[PDB]
Amino acid sequence: AEQNPLRLGVQLYALGRYDAALTLFERALKENPQDPEALYWLARTQLKLGLVNPALENGKTLVARTPRYLGGYMVLSEAYVALYRQAEDRERGKGYLEQALSVLKDAERVNPRYAPLHLQRGLVYALLGERDKAEASLKQALALEDTPEIRSALAELYLSMGRLDEALAQYAKALEQAPKDLDLRVRYASALLL
Amino acid sequence: AEQNPLRLGVQLYALGRYDAALTLFERALKENPQDPEALYWLARTQLKLGLVNPALENGKTLVARTPRYLGGYMVLSEAYVALYRQAEDRERGKGYLEQALSVLKDAERVNPRYAPLHLQRGLVYALLGERDKAEASLKQALALEDTPEIRSALAELYLSMGRLDEALAQYAKALEQAPKDLDLRVRYASALLL
Structure with a gap:
């Protein structure tokens, strides 16, 4: 029931x-x-x-x-x-x-x-x-x-720390695990807007 | 500035x-x-x-x-x-x-x-x-x-009232205005799932 x-x-x-x-x-x-x-x-x-x-x-x-x-x-x-x-x-x-x-x-x-x-x-x-x-x-x-969700948090913590290149690297990886992830694409894009 | x-x-x-x-x-x-x-x-x-x-x-x-x-x-x-x-x-x-x-x-x-x-x-x-x-x-x-957003609100209102057919019709209409809206496809699929 x-x-x-x-x-x-x-x-x-x-x-x-x-x-x-x-x-x-x-x-x-x-x-x-x-x-x-x-x-x-x-x-x-x-x-x-x-x-x-x-x-x-x-x-x-x-x-x-x-x-x-x-x-x-x-x-x-x-x-x-x-x-x-x-x-x-x-x-x-x-x-x-x-x-x-x-x-x-x-x-x-x-x-x-x-x-x-x-x-x-x-x-x-x-x-x-x-x-x-x-x-x-x-x-x-x-x-x-190792998952896209965590690679993203890591990315996020890198933007906070100022490690932009490293943040971008984590999104690129996260996007390889789930390439059709729009949520992920937007964060990557917005991040690229450095 | x-x-x-x-x-x-x-x-x-x-x-x-x-x-x-x-x-x-x-x-x-x-x-x-x-x-x-x-x-x-x-x-x-x-x-x-x-x-x-x-x-x-x-x-x-x-x-x-x-x-x-x-x-x-x-x-x-x-x-x-x-x-x-x-x-x-x-x-x-x-x-x-x-x-x-x-x-x-x-x-x-x-x-x-x-x-x-x-x-x-x-x-x-x-x-x-x-x-x-x-x-x-x-x-x-x-x-x-007439925007996808408003139709979506209306559809939501038709799901509350109990009009499934018409809630789905509204979602159908919203999707014709933005076919690539994934969030919109999810809600529609959720609706079809009764």
Whole structure:
């Protein structure tokens, strides 16, 4: 009963139709109110739909009742970053980022070989203006899973650091893995606009 | 001195590089502090970057200082819908959404023939559960500027109402106007997936 709605929700999510994804994940919960996987996806969809607080609360209940599930930390982790961008105060933002680093670290204890974590950790160090630590985490991420998405983050961290030639090199590589990626082409183009 | 940066941000905004546009528009504002155009691009980027509060406040300053400038109305209105989606309480959300329809009503008074305004109005009404009014607004916008974007909004409105056939027809029409719009092909395929 929760299979169909949950399965279709994951597909639509991958298709970028979050609003439709949300409703399916809700039906997934009305059938299995606890299920961390539905809550995880629900939360992920909420972050995409700009619904921060609700996703922060779902991440919280995910780490609290299923501390062994990486989803909770990931969801919770991204939620703090959103709150950081929305940081009313400058110092208020650092705290949230600090929390994101902390939760990512705890997740690292549950699995050190998970690419997404190292990716998120790098994205968090960058927001912290910690270019140095960001690269190592991203390279770490890449060492685990060489993918276009990570080559792009790396690229992004190079534009932030001022390593333009190196950023362009990472896009060129990312584009070889997925040559028909328009998202990727635009970043490469915009970057070429040096 | 403001020209170069401001013109560059608009292009980056159009390319989807909001963080980079956000910095360029800020430089613009430092060169020309009261220029409503720069203020407007800044606030609009803030919306895209999730910085809702600063945008609402910039939206309010525009409509107040430059009342004949539609930009401010579109931004303020969009910011009210950002707050709606983030609304904790259920009636706080309606107030925001209500604030949005007001700003737009204001807007129509400066120029009753600006399609984008009729596009937002249609959006807001849809959010209030007033589909009957939404369609009219969207059809009103569509009569002004028949664009793939507006058809897509209409189709969305037909998916909400339950008219799958007609939502698909709208997507079909939008694709004939921009056959290479991939995002547009995804939404259409998602729709066909019922």
